[PDB]
C-alpha cells in the first residue's frame, strides 16, 4: 500500500520538472507586470 518493497523514489528529473513549473509561473507573472507598465504607458 505504501509500495515500500517497490520503494518508489522520484529522481532528479522529477524535481527538475517541478523546477520548470515554478520558474514558468514566475516568468509569466513578471511578463504580465511588464505589460501592465507598458499598457499604463500607452494610456499616458
Amino acid at each position: 500500500s505504501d509500495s515500500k518493497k517497490n520503494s518508489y523514489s522520484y529522481g532528479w528529473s522529477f524535481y527538475f520538472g517541478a523546477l520548470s513549473f515554478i520558474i514558468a509561473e514566475m516568468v509569466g507573472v513578471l511578463a504580465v507586470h511588464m505589460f501592465i507598465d507598458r499598457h499604463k504607458q500607452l494610456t499616458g
Binding site: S13, F16, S20, M26
Partner: protein, 236 residues
C-alpha cells in the same frame, strides 16, 4: 547455535542467499554463534534488535508465549524438517506406533495437544491485550508538531518584520526585470527539455536486461532489480 542442525544445513546450503548469511557467520566479531539456545534468546533480548537469532519454529513460538513477550518470529520456513518417534530395528510395536501417530493426526489430537500447550499454557496469551480497542482523547504529543510550526511561524514573522523595518528605514528596475525574464525563460525551457528527454523520473524495482525480453519466461528471471525508469524509457 555453535553446534546444531541449523549449523549443518546452512553449511550444506547451495542457495546464494543462505551462503551470504553463511559467509557473514564465518567472519563476524563478536562471534555470532552461541553456546546454547537459551543463551541466544537472552542475547537477542539484550542486544535490542541489533542481533537476531535463527532457531526452529516451535522453539520460537514457545519463547513468544512466555514472558517478557519481547521476541518476534518473522519469515517463513527456510527448510522443512520433522520430528519422528524412534524405535529400533525389528520393532515389536513400531508399525502400530506409526498407526497410532496416524490416528492422533487424523483425529487432530496431535494438533489439539499442540495448539493447547504452546498458546494457552504460555504465560503471555496475547489475545487479550490484542483485543484492546479503546478510542481516547488526543494527547499534546500527537499534535505537537502543529504547535511547533505555529511558534516557528511566529518567530519568523517577527524576523521578517524587523528586517523589513530596517529596509524601510534605509528600487526595482524594469530593464533588470526584462533580463531576468529572458534568463528565466531560457532556464525553464532547459529544465523542461532535460526532464522529458533524460529519463530518471522514478527509482523503483523494475525489469532489466535479465528479462529485457518480456516474452521469455526464463524461470526465476531475477525478480526485478533497481530501475531508473523515466518518461520515454525504462532503464536499470
Amino acid at each position: 547455535l555453535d553446534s546444531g542442525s541449523t549449523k549443518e544445513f546452512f553449511r550444506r546450503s547451495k542457495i546464494a542467499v543462505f551462503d551470504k548469511m553463511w559467509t557473514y557467520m564465518r567472519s563476524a566479531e563478536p562471534s555470532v554463534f552461541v553456546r546454547t539456545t537459551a543463551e541466544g534468546v537472552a542475547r537477542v533480548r539484550k542486544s535490542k534488535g541489533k542481533y537476531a537469532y535463527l532457531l526452529e519454529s516451535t522453539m520460537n513460538e514457545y519463547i513468544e508465549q512466555r514472558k517478557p513477550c519481547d521476541t518476534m518470529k518473522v519469515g517463513g520456513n527456510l527448510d522443512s524438517k520433522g520430528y519422528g518417534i524412534a524405535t529400533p530395528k525389528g520393532s515389536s510395536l513400531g508399525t502400530p506406533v506409526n498407526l497410532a501417530v496416524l490416528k492422533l493426526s487424523e483425529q487432530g489430537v496431535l494438533d489439539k495437544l499442540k495448539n493447547k500447550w504452546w498458546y494457552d499454557k504460555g504465560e503471555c496469551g496475547a489475545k487479550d491485550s490484542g483485543s484492546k480497542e479503546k478510542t481516547s482523547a488526543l494527547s499534546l504529543s500527537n499534535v505537537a508538531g502543529v504547535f511547533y510550526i505555529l511558534v516557528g511561524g511566529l518567530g519568523l514573522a517577527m524576523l521578517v518584520a524587523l528586517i523589513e523595518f530596517c529596509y524601510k528605514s534605509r528600487l526595482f528596475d524594469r530593464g533588470v526585470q526584462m533580463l531576468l525574464t529572458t534568463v528565466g525563460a531560457f532556464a525553464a525551457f532547459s529544465l523542461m527539455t532535460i526532464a522529458v528527454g533524460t529519463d530518471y523520473w522514478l527509482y523503483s524495482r523494475g525489469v532489466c536486461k535479465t528479462k529485457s525480453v518480456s516474452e521469455d519466461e526464463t524461470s526465476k528471471k531475477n525478480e526485478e532489480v533497481m530501475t531508473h525508469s523515466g518518461l520515454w524509457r525504462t532503464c536499470c
